[PDB]
Amino acid sequence: TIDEGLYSRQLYVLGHEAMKQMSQSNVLIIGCKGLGVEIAKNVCLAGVKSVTLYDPQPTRIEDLSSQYFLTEDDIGVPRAKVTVSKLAELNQYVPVSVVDELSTEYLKNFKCVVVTETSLTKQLEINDFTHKNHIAYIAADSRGLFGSIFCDFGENFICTDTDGNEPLTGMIASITDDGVVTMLEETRHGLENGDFVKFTEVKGMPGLNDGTPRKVEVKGPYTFSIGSVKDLGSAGYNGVFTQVKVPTKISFKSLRESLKDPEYVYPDFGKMMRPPQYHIAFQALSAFADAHEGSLPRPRNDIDAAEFFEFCKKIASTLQFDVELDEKLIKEISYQARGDLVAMSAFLGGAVAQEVLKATTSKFYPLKQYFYFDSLESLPSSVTISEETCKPRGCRYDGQIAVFGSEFQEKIASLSTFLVGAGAIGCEMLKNWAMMGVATGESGHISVTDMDSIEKSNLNRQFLFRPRDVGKLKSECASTAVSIMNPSLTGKITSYQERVGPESEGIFGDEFFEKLSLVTNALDNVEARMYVDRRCVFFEKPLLESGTLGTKGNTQVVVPHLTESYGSSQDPPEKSFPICTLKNFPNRIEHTIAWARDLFEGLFKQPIDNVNMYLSSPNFLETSLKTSSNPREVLENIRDYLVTEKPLSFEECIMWARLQFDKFFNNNIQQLLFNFPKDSVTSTGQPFWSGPKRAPTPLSFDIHNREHFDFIVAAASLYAFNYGLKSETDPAIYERVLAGYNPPPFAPKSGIANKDKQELKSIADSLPPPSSLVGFRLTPAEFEKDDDSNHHIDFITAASNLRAMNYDITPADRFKTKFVAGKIVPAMCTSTAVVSGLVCLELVKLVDGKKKIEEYKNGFFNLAIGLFTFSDPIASPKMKVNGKEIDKIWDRYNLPDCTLQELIDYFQKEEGLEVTMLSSGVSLLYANFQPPKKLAERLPLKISELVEQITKKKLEPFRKHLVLEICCDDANGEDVEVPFICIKL
Amino acid sequence: MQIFVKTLTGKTITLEVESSDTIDNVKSKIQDKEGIPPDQQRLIFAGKQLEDGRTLSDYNIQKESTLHLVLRLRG
Amino acid sequence: ALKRINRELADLGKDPPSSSSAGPVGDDLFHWQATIMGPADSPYAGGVFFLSIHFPTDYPFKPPKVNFTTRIYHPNINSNGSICLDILRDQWSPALTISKVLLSISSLLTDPNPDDPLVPEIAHVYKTDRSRYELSAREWTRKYAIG
Numbered sequence A: 001t002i003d004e005g006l007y008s009r010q011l012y013v014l015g016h017e018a019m020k021q022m023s024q025s026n027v028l029i030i031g032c033k034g035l036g037v038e039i040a041k042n043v044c045l046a047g048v049k050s051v052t053l054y055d056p057q058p059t060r061i062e063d064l065s066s067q068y069f070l071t072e073d074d075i076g077v078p079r080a081k082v083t084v085s086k087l088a089e090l091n092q093y094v095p096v097s098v099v100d101e102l103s104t105e106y107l108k109n110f111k112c113v114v115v116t117e118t119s120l121t122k123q124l125e126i127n128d129f130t131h132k133n134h135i136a137y138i139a140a141d142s143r144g145l146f147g148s149i150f151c152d153f154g155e156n157f158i159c160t161d162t163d164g165n166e167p168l169t170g171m172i173a174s175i176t177d178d179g180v181v182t183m184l185e186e187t188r189h190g191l192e193n194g195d196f197v198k199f200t201e202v203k204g205m206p207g208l209n210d211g212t213p214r215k216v217e218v219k220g221p222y223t224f225s226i227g228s229v230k231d232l233g234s235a236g237y238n239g240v241f242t243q244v245k246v247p248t249k250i251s252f253k254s255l256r257e258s259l260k261d262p263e264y265v266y267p268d269f270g271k272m273m274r275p276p277q278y279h280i281a282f283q284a285l286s287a288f289a290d291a292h293e294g295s296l297p298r299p300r301n302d303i304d305a306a307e308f309f310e311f312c313k314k315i316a317s318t319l320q321f322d323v324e325l326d327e328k329l330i331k332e333i334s335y336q337a338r339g340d341l342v343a344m345s346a347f348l349g350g351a352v353a354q355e356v357l358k359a360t361t362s363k364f365y366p367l368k369q370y371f372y373f374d375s376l377e378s379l380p381s382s383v384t385i386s387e388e389t390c391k392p393r394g395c396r397y398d399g400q401i402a403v404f405g406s407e408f409q410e411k412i413a414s415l416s417t418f419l420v421g422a423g424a425i426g427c428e429m430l431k432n433w434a435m436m437g438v439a440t441g442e443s444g445h446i447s448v449t450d451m452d453s454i455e456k457s458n459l460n461r462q463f464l465f466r467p468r469d470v471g472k473l474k475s476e477c478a479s480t481a482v483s484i485m486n487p488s489l490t491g492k493i494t495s496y497q498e499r500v501g502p503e504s505e506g507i508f509g510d511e512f513f514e515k516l517s518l519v520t521n522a523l524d525n526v527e528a529r530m531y532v533d534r535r536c537v538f539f540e541k542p543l544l545e546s547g548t549l550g551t552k553g554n555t556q557v558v559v560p561h562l563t564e565s566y567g568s569s570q571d572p573p574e575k576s577f578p579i580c581t582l583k584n585f586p587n588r589i590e591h592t593i594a595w596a597r598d599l600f601e602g603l604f605k606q607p608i609d610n611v612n613m614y615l616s617s618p619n620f621l622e623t624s625l626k627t628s629s630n631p632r633e634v635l636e637n638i639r640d641y642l643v644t645e646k647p648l649s650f651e652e653c654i655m656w657a658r659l660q661f662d663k664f665f666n667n668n669i670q671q672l673l674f675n676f677p678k679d680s681v682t683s684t685g686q687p688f689w690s691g692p693k694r695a696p697t698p699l700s701f702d703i704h705n706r707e708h709f710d711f712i713v714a715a716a717s718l719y720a721f722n723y724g725l726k727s728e729t730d731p732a733i734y735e736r737v738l739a740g741y742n743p744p745p746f747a748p749k750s751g752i753a754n755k756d757k758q759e760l761k762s763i764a765d766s767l768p769p770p771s772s773l774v775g776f777r778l779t780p781a782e783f784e785k786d787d788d789s790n791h792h793i794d795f796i797t798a799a800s801n802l803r804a805m806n807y808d809i810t811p812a813d814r815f816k817t818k819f820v821a822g823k824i825v826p827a828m829c830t831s832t833a834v835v836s837g838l839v840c841l842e843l844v845k846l847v848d849g850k851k852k853i854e855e856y857k858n859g860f861f862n863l864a865i866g867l868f869t870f871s872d873p874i875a876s877p878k879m880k881v882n883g884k885e886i887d888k889i890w891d892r893y894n895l896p897d898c899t900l901q902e903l904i905d906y907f908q909k910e911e912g913l914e915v916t917m918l919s920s921g922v923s924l925l926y927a928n929f930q931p932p933k934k935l936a937e938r939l940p941l942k943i944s945e946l947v948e949q950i951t952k953k954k955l956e957p958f959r960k961h962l963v964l965e966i967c968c969d970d971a972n973g974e975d976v977e978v979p980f981i982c983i984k985l
Numbered sequence B: 001m002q003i004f005v006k007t008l009t010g011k012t013i014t015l016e017v018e019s020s021d022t023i024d025n026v027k028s029k030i031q032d033k034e035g036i037p038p039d040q041q042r043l044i045f046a047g048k049q050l051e052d053g054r055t056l057s058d059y060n061i062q063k064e065s066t067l068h069l070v071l072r073l074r075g
Numbered sequence C: 001a002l003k004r005i006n007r008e009l010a011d012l013g014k015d016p017p018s019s020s021s022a023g024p025v026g027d028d029l030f031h032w033q034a035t036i037m038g039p040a041d042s043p044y045a046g047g048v049f050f051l052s053i054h055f056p057t058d059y060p061f062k063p064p065k066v067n068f069t070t071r072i073y074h075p076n077i078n079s080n081g082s083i084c085l086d087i088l089r090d091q092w093s094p095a096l097t098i099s100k101v102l103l104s105i106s107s108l109l110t111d112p113n114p115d116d117p118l119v120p121e122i123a124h125v126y127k128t129d130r131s132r133y134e135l136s137a138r139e140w141t142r143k144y145a146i147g
């Protein structure tokens, strides 16, 4: 009963069973500050049974530093009471409540308990109970630029999936008598020692088809071992193996036990001596708070720092921690005790929400047990940070001023950012910017662009949108929501509905870009990312890239003249199957799905386009007769869809669907088996239908079968949609019409001048004239995966399953078909929160203008295994040109709009280089090997005039520069790379 | 006797061989002259691909026959 | 992209391919029209076959789209000109030049691969009735690939 219309992207990460088990768990959250509200938001979007909040403390102004559900009108009201109303709106399937008081026994009502902003004594009291009653307990804390997470799921936690990867499967070539299993040619099994596999469709060793898992002993990238199969048989041929995943048992320790002997999780291996320091530091913080009526050390106060260090020494002595305390780091923790940053809150909230999901669903490997994190490299160094600057000013930014100071707040308030995209990452970035006060000054500004509209499936991870906003533009809704969150951003945000690409350069031109301070990408495709990267490289603006995929995520920073651009790195491309495999010899469900998609396009999209173009373009036939690769195909499509097979009712559509079923699932298979019989052999004597090639069998139409009826219904409905007829769904009409159908005879054909053009002309003149059909058009079918009433996915699923039945492939359901055909990218709210937090932690580094490349960090993480890693950016490559140091990426030549001859002479006389090729855009302006006449005609022209002449298109009035790529040779004839040229028009 | 091997670029290589010479020996000569590894040599005569372990006489190769040297590609 | 394409074009210009001649269409560097000369000792002889090459924007990180324009009677080439070449679909790597692709296509023309065909009827004729395949190939290359 999972609403797949809302959890479409999340189910591809978790699954149906995981979410079903998740919808029966109760989550209690203690503490409703920024971290608590972030955790509650992520949990509510996740889809747990219900959420309960407990925070009776009255609101204070500083709490607004990271609480985006609190407004200045709520000062003096308990945080939970004012937050429940806004949290209840995020998801309609997840009720949210509030409890005024907590009793120990009451804790038995909840599956998971999350604790934040609670003293250590209360945490011990809660854990001593929740541990022995088998209740998952998570404790999170955020102090300035430091964070801590602790997990305790009981002594006998059962983890079904430990890595989140799909079971490994592959095709076997031969299995010896000693269990040596070998993969097909150029095929890697990918198994690891100790894994369990099950075999099916094994020839020669039926005993392995039972399904009992067997141990795996990897012997190489192409072969492994399973043990002794002596009894079962001597040698097995072919077959498919599939990995089996066994549950694991994880034993946690209670908080009281784990204080003495903790088990750390290291987010980075460059600093492995810190977590022991933070373990003492946080306990010292708790003791100090207990000793001062719950008052944390004041910001950048020396006396409080000394007292905190004395507490740290006492704790270290008490716990027999044989570790020398680092005074600098501990006192830094003391200084930032009262800090409250929205970026750290978002990061820890995403992590803790993922831990809650792990606890509820018994999936993925959880943290075990202490996770201490710090982003201390983000502390500004170009401004004055002291007690005077960091003291509170009685404003909503106190939580951030306590870490960065007032001068850095002024620096942030005057930013002019440019956000590309308004998806999940875009929404999180806008929330973080609004909380941080970005562009709230006189000179500040924000620009957000996105051309897409809100859809139902987007509401699962884009919390700024509501069901009432479905169908509206993302940018406007996001801007309005963030303006509501922070009133100071009224009038400081601009929203565009423009796609960032070559066609939008009239809006995002030189004037628009010259005023920016940084660009943040929230895109989902590589083309736009590359384009924006090129624009930033040309204009020399900092860029922040971030990407997510399921539970994996990464963040990268591009700094002018310091690091390399986004395009300097290559990512694995999409896998496209050979045309021969798809056309005739499929062996996986993906091949059949691709074939079904091609069939859909060729049946309901291309012929309609040809018919429409014929009725519109007066000279379409002549152009097609010598331009298209198959004019006969176009003419046949036009004839069939206009006169020969034009339906007059829905019964004719049903008959056409039956005919197409016969055409594509019964006759082509017969022809293929006529060309290559099942007993045929290759040129080497081996059987033809062996290994990757599976022998097909024609299908006979059975109306009672479900798949056949589904295909008929979908095809008839789509044909009626094409011709605008009234479709029907009652099986009675289908069964009545298809009963009286006589299949035309079909016998495979063995085969065995210029008159063809005459036949083509005869067909062409047989078509009705365009003038006779004015105002008549056929509606093409544009593929749309997200709609379940257009029969697109239904048709694709039916066709794919029928072709799988042809080749004895295991059919898939509509869920997997939608996942594969639609190129759906799995997405999660927790991953989005984490990447937004990391990007906003890099943003403060960018604002401070840090120069060293070791101070920036590109981040990668995988939440299914609890892996976090950070590495320095790669420096931009250097080069030697004319005995000078040149940056390959961030350097360019600035020249006037001189003539081509003058440009060549300048490059010859100044750089001592001979120009051999000069191009602009996608046109070859000049090449050394061109005939002399062409050059003599082109040499004395200006660059702008040359570009206009060659590209046959006048330059736009808003164009102010030209980017030219030049390849030149040195005096000796050796090729030397040079930076591009920036011609100023 | 003498034979001719034509490459993809239109070049003709003349070889002095005997009808009893093995295909391996011919591939060795082609490797020595052009530097092409035997594994990547695809030798064709009269529409039939020469296979290792056989002799020229097995393919009825006689005085001044013409072979084709093409690359190994499958799919 | 542009620099790599121009380097390949210059390399073609410096050393003539003899049996091939590729060049940009008009002045566009992302659209080439190449020519292939049929192997002499094959049915596709005395023939000139025109191919269209479309370099993707991500070249050389994505394979170029190569399609025959002249009709050819080959088991691995269909009516639309699509070529059953492994180096153009999934075996592509940013280390293969256009000259290598043209040499591969010339080898393919030298000898088809009927065990993994793209046009089952032509492959069946080739495997069963060789003489009829030769006659049909000669007829097609005389009717279409000449003049």
Ligand SMILES: Nc1ncnc2c1ncn2[C@@H]1O[C@H](COP(=O)(O)OP(=O)(O)OP(=O)(O)O)[C@@H](O)[C@H]1O
Pocket (backbone or CB within 6 Å): A009, A420, A421, A422, A423, A424, A425, A449, A450, A451, A452, A453, A458, A474, A498, A499, A500, A501, A522, A523, A524, A525, A528, A825, A827
């Ligand atoms: N070239 C582009 N210019 C501007 N905005 C873009 C461009 N390409 C993508 N976007 C926007 O980037 C955002 C990507 O976010 P996301 O992928 O989560 O959303 P979606 O594609 O609508 O959803 P889903 O992928 O889950 O079906 C979308 O708003 C999309 O409109």
Ligand SMILES: [Mg+2]
Pocket (backbone or CB within 6 Å): A452, A453, A455
């Ligand atoms: Mg969308």
Ligand SMILES: [Mg+2]
Pocket (backbone or CB within 6 Å): A524, A825
């Ligand atoms: Mg998307």
